[PDB]
Ligand binder design. Sequence first.
Ligand SMILES: [Mn+2]
Ligand SMILES: [Mn+2]
Ligand SMILES: [Mn+2]
Lengths: 153, 152, 153
Amino acid sequence: SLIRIGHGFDVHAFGEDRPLIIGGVEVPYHTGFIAHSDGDVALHALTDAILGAAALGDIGKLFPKNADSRGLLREAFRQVQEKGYKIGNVDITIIAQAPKMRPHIDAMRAKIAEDLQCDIEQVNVKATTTEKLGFTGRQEGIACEAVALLIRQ
Amino acid sequence: SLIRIGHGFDVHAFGEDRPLIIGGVEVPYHTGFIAHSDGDVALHALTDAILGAAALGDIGKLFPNADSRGLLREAFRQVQEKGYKIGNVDITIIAQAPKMRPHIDAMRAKIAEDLQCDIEQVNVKATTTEKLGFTGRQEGIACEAVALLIRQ
Amino acid sequence: SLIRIGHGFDVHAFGEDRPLIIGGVEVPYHTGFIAHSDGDVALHALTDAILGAAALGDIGKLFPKNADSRGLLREAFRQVQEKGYKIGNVDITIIAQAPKMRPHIDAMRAKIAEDLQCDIEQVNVKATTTEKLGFTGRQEGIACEAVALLIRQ
Ligand SMILES: [Mn+2]
Ligand SMILES: [Mn+2]
Ligand SMILES: [Mn+2]
């Protein structure tokens, strides 16, 4: 096509890591959901949005490591380009029961702009809350939604 | 306009049936939300997104029935009447379930068939909420969808 | 860029007031989330999507008035308009455990069509429930999803 739209959604449940001594041996004990990523909800959702607009499925097909989400994002963009697309613009909506992120937003945009090889003017990020409601409101984790518009370069 | 965008969100809450003997007669008893469809959250959301992009309201403004594919075709036909065809659609199933990947392409083929477009204009993905929220507690499933329509 | 895509999400948690007598004085007592707006999730989500498409951040950057969401929405359109954008079309999905809202949907579309200086035909509003599930299903609040397509004017 000449223009494609994609959508992404992701959640990160909060988990904790604590050291324990079992059988005289120091071992790591993980509490909460077992993550297989850095939990970067904004990049995971954004990554699913771009792959989806190009009909490439989802983040779960980028490498048949995963600890780094910018690596996954680049790999997705690499593949999107292979199909002839470049970024039109993307918009990300972080859903968290948190306040101060604006100082960090622009930094996020730049990083995303860098990995998608586009201007920062094509990347928007925002954060909003659920006003103490739901799992994000009770602070059990965070979520993120993202939309992307692809164009033929 | 020659290019339209639309969005859909849908939820299906799990419910169950069980037989009961009351007054010497067996009667069916339903537990949970009463369903009025096959519960296909992906097609319902997709339908809303397509109807939404054309400013045709939503699934509720179709038949003033249970098979979601019929609703989906009805929505596409109405979007055709206005002169649109599918640019591309992207579906995101939100459920606390494992393997659906084996059935994804089957889903894409049927959606492509109903929207009279190529399977390549259709994307379907499934993600989880990592045991959080009503989908995480497995009380039901949800789905979000976006659709881009192009002027025919 | 000739076409821009945007996304918005908003939630409004319910809160009731109750007058009391303290120190022989009457004072209003608030229960629940402290509201800072009229709680119009539809216009807030819409506002975030329009600004998000133009990479203007979010609704919380407009007026550094908040008691009226249309004011904020018209302001948002003003700024997108300054970057040379006009509405392509917008689609809004209100998520609430409520029924009778259809009779008011067209009235909403007209007001939105007015603040976005476009035709009502370019504005869609739909409503759905979560079938008694989640915080909206338990009736603790309401939510709204929004996407916007901006076109170069
Ligand atoms: Mn995930
Ligand atoms: Mn439903
Ligand atoms: Mn809010």
